[PDB]
């Protein structure tokens, strides 16, 4: 069966229909009308999985896919043209260009936290490059899994773009098929499993994993604006975002000031009780609810610390004077718990960060430009945003991807089209004349 | 032991010395003077492994590395600079750019057919990107392995750039270590193993594997020039070249003409008897001598066919009316055997190619531009060259890589630098002011 589904998609790609640029634009526009016409359903699905509301849904997920769709629908023609290359002395009379072409069948494996985004956005790039795409939605956010399984065949081509539903068993069986590229977003442990399956077929993979994205706060920094931005990004989806400020690094002198401004900003967004605000989200499930909660134990709780097991609620909690060897500083906190670790100097912040796996993101808050550049020039991470948070992943002109444990590969905008296609180097010398190649053929000069 | 060597490099890389662009250039120039001061020895080692003479050693191998070095040394500074990115409406005031940075320790595993180039060339891009490099020379070309293992320590940094000699057991053990990138040039089967090992540490890999590079000769084509060019690339290293025109596909009407024109050029390069020409290479070893030799059995030998077991010689043999199901058409011929397979049309030539694993190269010879374009546009291969052979692999401005079975990743010139480094996206808003982001923070509008 799963095999039959993969076959159906490959044979249809072999038909050559996706070779038409016109076709891709129509499909892309189908995807676009699918979203617009079903915003309500998508929002509702999102509400049932993570308790989002019409606004957080659109602005945090859906609105990003739509910007992607718009960029690529408009630029695709330019992206598809043969890219000319710089000629060398030897190639002055020859054509040297780069030809892009579909890879074939791409597997897009999504995640639960942003179930609509982490599945449809990569797909925009995959359809743009002329590939057939098989979506494997996360089963953890089951409501969106179903919606996508129903919506896709109502708008997309039913032979080229297919949705496979299922948990671990369905995926494992699916990873035995042969794809020309596997896009995966999830955990570092499972990322390994994915790559290992791909090795058996020599298939290339794009891996967006995660880690602990540090957030360095410099003394010379408007702490009011700084903390207003940091709080937004950190509690945005109940702390469940891949490029979220996992923990704060700062000098002990501003330790408490950070705390006050954070809780201030918390009040401005969610009022006195977060559990009252409709804009605050709920944790995905019980297992994660227990693990995030357990991370607050034997810790110095300065704010928050309360939770509601029934609604899978966990109050915007802040922790102070945290021990880097404690569990909140040993695992990626995929929740609303903000630890604050203290470092005596910038040198100290850098050594700290560099003593751990490379993160998907790195943030620096400072008024001193030199501090911003020294942080960047001396650390390594997928992407970076100085004096803000999350935002770098939202710019089409900035490719999104990790390094080391944060993963490999990138994918927003044109970088998506490139990744889901092959870039073939062609040197054309249709000039079968002017054979001044004499010097290359033997016999060798005596 | 191998563990300690890897430790030496990783710690050395942590010292941060490669960061200095000045250091890199000195290590790049050092490598350059190693080549320039030891040409005789390099050629010697090539002679003993593949029976190459100073002329074929330089122009086929050594001279390509020297061009790469010359390009990177001159363009490194510009390649290293942060790359500005196009701003969006929402980011007009901010800084958006891409910062390149070393990955760490890079393992380069080379192949025997071109033992100097296949190790030192990818290394050039690795050193340029500020990484520490560990060379794993092919043991099969034993002489180049001992040469390299002694020359490197004399010119390069003895902590940063280290050579590891060994066969299977040593490489196996060596593949358990953690590297930040693995460059590999070899067979498809071993490529699958290298990537499997890679999976364990989530390390990215550049794989240049092989396949059977087709060569379609069109009717409307100057058969003289064509065959002159094809004979040169095909027999260049006793046929032992990764991008060599593996077999010819043509209309029977010219089946015999090509044969005549090929053997004519053969006379022009190696005289009447190739076993007499000093410009003709010898098969690496006995094992390969036998496999290649056997591909001539049960075949219609239209030229050559003689061989000397003692000197591992195999004459420039041609074969006509070859059956696709015969062993010469089932495996990549890594020798001087050139089969001719007939097809009734261009559409047919295309279907033949697509019905097989993707090749590293695809060559087209014709005077009709439209046939060249229709060919490229309907097939897929790593690279392509129209009306010549091998040549695209020699243009630095042209990235070299495969697709599907021919491998993943590319590595010439600047593309080499990009590949051995991390391209980190940065969004700098040193502007902690003009905070008109109100519309993004909760509570959602009523
Ligand atoms: N889901 C995400 O976006 C995500 C991303 C990064 C880190 N994390 C964090 O990592 C931890 C565990 O998260 P989780 O998402 O693994 O929990 P989970 O168990 O709820 O989700 C597991 C996902 O992994 C898949 N999977 C499990 N075994 C597999 C296998 N053997 N082969 C292929 N796929 C397999 C499942 O089918 C499932 O969809 C938590 O701290 C979580 O916050 C989650
Ligand atoms: N060497 C090349 O550049 C090359 C490239 C493409 C295709 N080929 C072809 O493929 C066929 C076999 O070639 P070959 O070079 O494998 O012959 P070979 O046995 O002489 O070379 C084997 C190489 O593979 C390595 N290897 C073997 N087992 C390994 C393992 N288990 N883990 C890691 N590395 C391991 C060896 O250490 C060795 O360097 C021939 O037809 C040949 O022409 C060779």
Swiss-Prot record, chains A, B:
<keyword id="KW-0560">Oxidoreductase</keyword>
<dbReference type="GO" id="GO:0004029">
    <property type="term" value="F:aldehyde dehydrogenase (NAD+) activity"/>
</dbReference>
<dbReference type="InterPro" id="IPR012394">
    <property type="entry name" value="Aldehyde_DH_NAD(P)"/>
</dbReference>
<dbReference type="GO" id="GO:0006081">
    <property type="term" value="P:aldehyde metabolic process"/>
</dbReference>
<dbReference type="GO" id="GO:0008284">
    <property type="term" value="P:positive regulation of cell population proliferation"/>
</dbReference>
<dbReference type="GO" id="GO:0016020">
    <property type="term" value="C:membrane"/>
</dbReference>
<dbReference type="GO" id="GO:0016620">
    <property type="term" value="F:oxidoreductase activity, acting on the aldehyde or oxo group of donors, NAD or NADP as acceptor"/>
</dbReference>
<protein>
    <recommendedName>
        <fullName>Aldehyde dehydrogenase, dimeric NADP-preferring</fullName>
        <ecNumber>1.2.1.5</ecNumber>
    </recommendedName>
</protein>
<keyword id="KW-0520">NAD</keyword>
<dbReference type="GO" id="GO:0007584">
    <property type="term" value="P:response to nutrient"/>
</dbReference>
<feature type="active site">
    <location>
        <position position="242"/>
    </location>
</feature>
<dbReference type="InterPro" id="IPR016162">
    <property type="entry name" value="Ald_DH_N"/>
</dbReference>
<dbReference type="InterPro" id="IPR016163">
    <property type="entry name" value="Ald_DH_C"/>
</dbReference>
<dbReference type="GO" id="GO:0008106">
    <property type="term" value="F:alcohol dehydrogenase (NADP+) activity"/>
</dbReference>
<feature type="modified residue" description="N6-acetyllysine">
    <location>
        <position position="192"/>
    </location>
</feature>
<dbReference type="GO" id="GO:0005737">
    <property type="term" value="C:cytoplasm"/>
</dbReference>
<keyword id="KW-0521">NADP</keyword>
<comment type="similarity">
    <text>Belongs to the aldehyde dehydrogenase family.</text>
</comment>
<feature type="modified residue" description="N6-acetyllysine">
    <location>
        <position position="176"/>
    </location>
</feature>
<dbReference type="GO" id="GO:0051591">
    <property type="term" value="P:response to cAMP"/>
</dbReference>
<dbReference type="GO" id="GO:0018479">
    <property type="term" value="F:benzaldehyde dehydrogenase (NAD+) activity"/>
</dbReference>
<dbReference type="GO" id="GO:0009410">
    <property type="term" value="P:response to xenobiotic stimulus"/>
</dbReference>
<feature type="binding site">
    <location>
        <begin position="186"/>
        <end position="191"/>
    </location>
    <ligand>
        <name>NAD(+)</name>
    </ligand>
</feature>
<dbReference type="GO" id="GO:0004028">
    <property type="term" value="F:3-chloroallyl aldehyde dehydrogenase activity"/>
</dbReference>
<dbReference type="InterPro" id="IPR029510">
    <property type="entry name" value="Ald_DH_CS_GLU"/>
</dbReference>
<dbReference type="GO" id="GO:0005829">
    <property type="term" value="C:cytosol"/>
</dbReference>
<keyword id="KW-0007">Acetylation</keyword>
<feature type="active site">
    <location>
        <position position="208"/>
    </location>
</feature>
<keyword id="KW-0963">Cytoplasm</keyword>
<dbReference type="GO" id="GO:0051384">
    <property type="term" value="P:response to glucocorticoid"/>
</dbReference>
<dbReference type="GO" id="GO:0006629">
    <property type="term" value="P:lipid metabolic process"/>
</dbReference>
<dbReference type="InterPro" id="IPR015590">
    <property type="entry name" value="Aldehyde_DH_dom"/>
</dbReference>
<dbReference type="GO" id="GO:0001666">
    <property type="term" value="P:response to hypoxia"/>
</dbReference>
<dbReference type="Pfam" id="PF00171">
    <property type="entry name" value="Aldedh"/>
</dbReference>
<dbReference type="InterPro" id="IPR016161">
    <property type="entry name" value="Ald_DH/histidinol_DH"/>
</dbReference>
<comment type="subunit">
    <text>Homodimer.</text>
</comment>
<comment type="function">
    <text>ALDHs play a major role in the detoxification of alcohol-derived acetaldehyde. They are involved in the metabolism of corticosteroids, biogenic amines, neurotransmitters, and lipid peroxidation. Oxidizes medium and long chain aldehydes into non-toxic fatty acids. Preferentially oxidizes aromatic aldehyde substrates. Comprises about 50 percent of corneal epithelial soluble proteins. May play a role in preventing corneal damage caused by ultraviolet light.</text>
</comment>
<dbReference type="InterPro" id="IPR016160">
    <property type="entry name" value="Ald_DH_CS_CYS"/>
</dbReference>
<keyword id="KW-0443">Lipid metabolism</keyword>
């Amino acid at each position: 069966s799963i095999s039959d589904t993969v076959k159906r998609a490959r044979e249809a790609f072999n038909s050559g229909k996706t070779r038409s640029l016109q076709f891709r634009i129509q499909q892309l526009e189908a995807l676009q009308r699918m979203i617009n016409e079903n915003l309500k359903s998508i929002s509702g699905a999102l509400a049932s999985d993570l308790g989002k509301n019409e606004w957080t849904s659109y602005y945090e997920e859906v609105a990003h896919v739509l910007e992607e769709l718009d960029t690529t629908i408009k630029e695709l023609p330019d992206w598809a043209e043969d890219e000319p290359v710089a000629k060398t002395r030897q190639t002055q009379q020859d054509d040297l260009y780069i030809h892009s072409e579909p890879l074939g069948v791409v597997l897009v494996i999504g995640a639960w936290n942003y179930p609509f985004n982490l599945t449809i956005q990569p797909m925009v790039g995959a359809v743009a490059a002329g590939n057939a795409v098989i979506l494997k939605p996360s089963e953890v956010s089951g409501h969106m899994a179903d919606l996508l399984a129903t919506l896709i065949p109502q708008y997309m081509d039913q032979n080229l773009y297919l949705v496979v539903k299922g948990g671990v068993p369905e995926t494992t069986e699916l990873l035995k098929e042969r794809f020309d590229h596997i896009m995966y977003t999830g955990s570092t442990a499972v990322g390994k499993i994915v790559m290992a399956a791909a090795a058996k077929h020599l298939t290339p993979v794009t891996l967006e994993l995660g880690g602990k994205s540090p957030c360095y706060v410099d003394k010379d920094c408007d702490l009011d604006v700084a903390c207003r931005r940091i709080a937004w990004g950190k509690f945005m989806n109940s702390g469940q975002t891949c490029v979220a400020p996992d923990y704060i690094l700062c000098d002990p002198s501003i330790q408490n000031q950070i705390v006050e401004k954070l809780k201030k900003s918390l009040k401005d967004f969610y009022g006195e009780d977060a559990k009252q605000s409709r804009d605050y989200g709920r944790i995905i499930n019980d297992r994660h609810f227990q693990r995030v909660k357990g991370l607050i134990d034997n810790q110095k709780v300065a704010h928050g610390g309360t939770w509601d097991q029934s609604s899978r609620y966990i109050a915007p909690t802040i922790l102070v004077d945290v021990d880097p060897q404690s569990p909140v500083m040993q695992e990626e906190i995929f929740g609303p718990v903000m630890p604050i670790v203290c470092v005596r100097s910038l040198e100290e912040a850098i050594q700290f960060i560099n003593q751990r796996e490379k993160p998907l993101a790195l943030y620096v808050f400072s008024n001193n430009e030199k501090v911003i550049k020294k942080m960047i020039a001396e650390t390594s991470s997928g992407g970076v945003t100085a004096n803000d948070v999350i935002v770098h992943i939202t710019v089409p002109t900035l490719p999104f991807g990790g390094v080391g444990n944060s993963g490999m590969g990138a994918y927003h905008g044109k970088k998506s089209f490139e990744t889901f296609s092959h870039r073939r180097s062609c040197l054309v010398k249709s000039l079968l004349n002017e054979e001044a190649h004499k010097a290359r053929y033997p016999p060798s000069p005596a």
